[PDB]
């Protein structure tokens, strides 16, 4: 078990520890970015609850995830959430961002999905890529046609527990008219309905993807901590076994010396 012990101690324990450490270093930067974007997200949500723009009564599904390869349970949780949403309505053009979520959508509803984007979860989120993705989504898929747009992205409460929080997207139809659109002065010639629709489609999706990256790397830290605990207890029990076996060598040499000599 010498090779097994070696591959347990220096090939799945210490490097997993340092990879959890680099995950935490990424977690700090992504938390800074997440709070920075959550500033304008909180502003937008408080404005929207101040001016109710709920949409009444052709659906869009946006699968937003990083490039991490199923770090424990975050990707399975997102897959089950999108599966439940598809069970609610399987008639939406699903757009997938990432790789693991992309293949999950492929294996669940290959017909519904019509757009996939790769090379996104390389590092911490950037605004330019998110805005370009939003432009492409609103151009080729025409998100304005769908009254409701769903964005999937996990939310960690403090460190560990995650939920598939979804934020509604308001289209120009529900901006040009709303129960409380008269509170805020608007310019008809400025085409502010469509402008605000595109602005929320950009900001909500960008911060959703930033929060999804933060939750993905938090779940990565949790999964690598679980793997570290598994390595630790496996190493403890196998080191007890190693001591037992190496002492059994002493018992064997004792017995053959007192029998032969």
């Amino acid at each position: 078990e010498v090779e097994m012990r070696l591959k347990s101690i220096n090939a799945i324990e210490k490097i997993t520890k340092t990879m959890k450490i680099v995950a935490s270093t990424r977690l700090s930067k992504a938390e800074k970015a997440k709070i920075s974007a959550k500033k304008m997200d909180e502003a937008e949500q408080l404005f929207y609850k101040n001016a109710e723009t709920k949409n009444l009564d052709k659906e869009l599904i946006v699968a937003i995830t990083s490039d991490k390869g199923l770090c424990g349970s975050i990707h399975s949780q997102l897959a089950k959430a999108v599966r439940r949403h598809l069970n609610d309505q399987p008639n939406a053009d699903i757009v997938t961002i990432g790789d693991k979520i992309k293949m999950q959508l492929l294996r669940t509803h290959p017909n519904n999905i019509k757009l996939s984007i790769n090379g996104i979860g390389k590092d911490a989120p950037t605004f330019q890529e998110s805005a370009l993705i939003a432009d492409k989504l609103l151009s080729v898929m025409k998100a304005g046609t769908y009254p409701k747009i769903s964005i999937f992205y996990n939310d960690p409460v403090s460190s560990l527990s995650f939920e598939p929080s979804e934020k509604p997207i308001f289209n120009a139809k529900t901006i040009e008219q709303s129960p409380s659109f008269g509170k805020f002065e608007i310019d008809t010639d400025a085409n502010v309905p469509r402008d605000l629709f595109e602005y929320t489609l950009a900001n909500q999706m960008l911060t959703a993807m930033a929060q999804g990256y933060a939750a993905e790397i938090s779940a990565r830290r949790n999964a690598m901590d679980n793997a570290s605990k598994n390595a630790g207890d496996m190493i403890n029990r196998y080191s007890i076994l190693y001591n037992r076996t190496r002492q059994a060598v002493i018992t064997n040499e004792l017995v053959d010396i007192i029998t032969g000599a």
Binding site: I12, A223, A231
Partner: protein, 118 residues
């Protein structure tokens, strides 16, 4: 100079794939199969397919395995394993290589499982 250069290369490559599988056994076990590089995952899948392909029904063990004990010629095995190593059968499920002989048996089993599963 004994079995031929192609046979030697095929044997070395299959040994490489199976050794990668054995080395990454623990990585798949508790670290996570999905938490792996694309090339390593592909090599692991190829090694698993090869290990399933190594199974061969025996005529003397027909009552044991439940499959007729067909035989495979050395050239057929070399060609089939060379084709498998090239990735021409990656989409085929691993269970198709279970308890089969040549690559013809592999494709027949794949077709039959696709028909029965739909």
């Amino acid at each position: 100079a004994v079995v031929g250069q192609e046979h030697y290369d095929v044997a070395s490559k299959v040994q490489e794939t199976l050794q990668t599988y054995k080395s990454l056994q623990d990585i798949i076990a508790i670290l996570g199969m999905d938490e792996l590089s694309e090339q390593d995952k592909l090599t692991v899948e190829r090694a698993r397919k090869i290990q399933r392909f190594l199974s061969q029904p025996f005529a003397v063990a027909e009552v044991f395995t439940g499959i007729p004990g067909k035989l495979v010629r050395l050239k057929d095995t070399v060609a089939s394993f060379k084709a498998v190593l090239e990735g021409k059968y990656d989409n085929i499920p691993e269970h198709a290589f279970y308890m089969v002989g040549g690559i013809e048996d592999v494709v027949a089993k794949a077709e039959k499982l696709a028909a029965e599963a739909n």
